[PDB]
């Protein structure tokens, strides 16, 4: 749910809108509230008594519960123990407290809560801000490296602050020491994991040397493919002109960047005017079956058929659309009148529309 | 149409040129002048890819 | 087309 | 083997759920040399390298008459024929000429879902996404940085499924 200890916790030991906030309550049972005024006024007696008794004079509260469960859910959240343990140490904090409370102790329990809200965040934010712990192994590591390549230099500690940023960078990366070296993992439970001491071992002697030598794949096998990948995570930093180019470390730089640069980009890339209304429908169908009835069975006129449908009709629809009703009925009158094969055919053949221009 | 596992079959003649491509030019000419009484296309791997 | 090959008259006489 | 040139791993599919389950390294592929020299060993060696390299790449970069539904279908909207409809006095005998209204029936037939889903993979979208994964310096770090997704009987939020309950 939330990760702030304290509102993580106080879901747990708290009511629904008591009077442990007493403003609010006090204003809604007055008048006070705008949302819905009037709303206390009306509750059977027994409540509204109630509420007034506890509003008038409030009951005290311990909540020596609240901040033990407050410090024991940060514990829990910050992978002191496992949720078990946590079951287990409510208890476990709750008699310690018990056996010996004093109002000191609760002091040091609020300031603890405090402390430990605190701490939670301040967790979370550096678990998300880069992971100090990785930098430190990676500078004892760069220690243990030396800093003095006979041949070529400024590619060398150019790699070296590339390699720097590139951890400092990417959270989430993991650099350590197991045995007797240290390695590169760009993520936890995740593949793609670099020998660091062994790949600069292989690159200590590829640095200032290889330039001349990038056109033929002569020496192309000194690089061993740990390094290679260890290259290949460095493609997006170390971009053009840090590294020398012209030269077989340079150019393997530049073909990945320009590969991995092409990929992203692309990525991010991915990927009869007028027509009546229901209602209308439903009143010309209407007509046309008012019209055709009468004009078939009662042998009437077409005038004085279209007269009787109107009358037929629900006064409240019939006022409601007087004028699309009058505007047909006069059509309807005119096309009768002059083109009695049109009428009969708008007449007896449903699917019909008018056409337009009779807007 | 595997392109992870091509260049493991291609060394192993599973899949991949035929038998007169990858054989040295001298050695397949060698093979078509002396077929008739000492054979050799029998000793060599030929693919088929369906 | 061609990329499908697997790559690596009876009348009464007419001798 | 070596830390450098690793057997590949290969996952394997569940088709029923459209997970994916825990995957292990080629175990049917591999060539047998140990009866061969220091050259094709090497050779053996550079090919198995090459093939690392194909497989790393390639997963990181590659990720009217309207047809109706493989048979094309015509539409008319104004292709009404019978214009009759029975009233009182006319008895409408046996009819109808199967027509695809061009909005309505069209569009009811080529609705979408309500809902688009949220779970498992088809097997296309598995073999596109899930190439086999080339596994560097296997297990190197501290206990809980390894690769769980390898084990078949490992849960991602319950860690270490418990099999037979």
Request: proline share 7%.
């Amino acid at each position: 749910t939330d990760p702030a200890v304290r509102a993580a916790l106080q879901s747990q030991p708290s009511g629904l809108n008591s009077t442990d906030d007493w403003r609010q309550v006090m204003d809604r049972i007055m008048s006070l509230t705008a949302r819905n005024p009037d709303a206390f006024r009306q509750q059977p007696q027994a409540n509204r008594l109630s509420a007034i008794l506890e509003a008038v004079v409030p009951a005290r509260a311990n909540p020596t519960h609240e901040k033990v469960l407050a410090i024991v859910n940060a514990l829990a959240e910050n992978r002191a123990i496992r949720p078990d343990e946590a079951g287990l140490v409510y208890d476990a904090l709750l008699q310690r407290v018990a056996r010996y409370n004093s109002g000191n102790v609760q002091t040091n329990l609020d300031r603890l809560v405090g402390d430990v809200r605190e701490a939670v965040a301040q967790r979370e934010r550096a678990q998300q801000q880069g992971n100090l712990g990785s930098m430190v192994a990676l500078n004892a590591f760069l220690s243990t490296q030396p800093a003095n390549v006979p041949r070529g230099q400024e590619d060398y500690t150019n790699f070296v602050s590339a390699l720097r940023l590139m951890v400092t960078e990417t959270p989430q990366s993991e650099v350590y020491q197991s045995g007797p070296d240290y390695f590169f993992q760009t993520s936890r439970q995740g593949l793609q994991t670099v020998n660091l001491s062994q790949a600069f071992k292989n690159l200590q002697g590829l640095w200032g040397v290889r330039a001349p030598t990038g056109d033929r794949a002569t020496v192309s096998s000194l690089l061993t493919p740990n390094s290679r990948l260890l290259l290949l995570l460095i493609a997006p930093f170390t971009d053009s002109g840090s590294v020398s180019r012209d030269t077989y470390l340079g150019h393997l730089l530049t073909l990945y960047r320009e590969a991995i640069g092409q990929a992203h980009v692309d990525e991010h890339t991915f990927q009869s005017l007028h027509s009546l209304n229901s209602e209308e429908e439903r009143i010309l169908r209407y007509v046309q079956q008012s019209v055709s009835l009468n004009l078939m069975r009662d042998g009437v006129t077409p005038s004085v058929a279209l007269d009787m449908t109107a009358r037929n009709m629900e006064p409240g629809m019939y006022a409601s659309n007087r004028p699309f009703i009058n505007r047909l009925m006069d059509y309807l009158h005119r096309a009768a009148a002059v083109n009695p094969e049109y009428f009969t055919n708008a007449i007896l053949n449903p699917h019909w529309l008018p056409p337009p221009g009779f807007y | 149409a595997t392109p992870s596992m091509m260049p493991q079959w291609s060394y192993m003649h599973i899949s991949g040129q035929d038998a007169s491509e990858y054989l040295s030019p001298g050695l397949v000419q060698f093979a078509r002048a002396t077929e008739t009484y000492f054979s050799l296309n029998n000793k060599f791997r030929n693919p088929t890819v369906a | 087309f061609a990329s499908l090959a697997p790559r690596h008259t009876s009348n009464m006489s007419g001798g | 083997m070596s830390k450098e040139i690793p057997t590949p791993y290969m996952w394997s599919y569940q088709p029923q759920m459209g997970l994916a389950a825990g995957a292990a390294q080629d175990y049917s592929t591999r060539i047998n040399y140990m009866s061969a020299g220091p050259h094709m060993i090497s050779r053996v060696n550079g090919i198995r390298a090459h093939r690392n390299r194909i497989l790393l790449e390639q997963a990181a970069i590659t990720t009217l008459t309207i047809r109706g539904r493989g048979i094309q279908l015509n539409d008319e909207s104004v292709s009404s024929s019978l214009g009759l409809r029975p009233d009182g006095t006319f008895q409408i005998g046996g009819a109808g000429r199967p027509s695809f209204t061009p909005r309505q029936a069209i569009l009811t037939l080529q609705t979408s879902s309500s809902e688009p889903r949220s779970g498992g993979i088809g097997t296309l979208q598995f073999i596109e996404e899930f190439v086999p994964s080339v596994y560097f310096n296997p297990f190197s770090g501290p206990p809980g940085h390894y690769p769980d997704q390898f084990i078949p009987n490992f849960d991602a939020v319950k860690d270490s499924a418990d099999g037979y309950d």
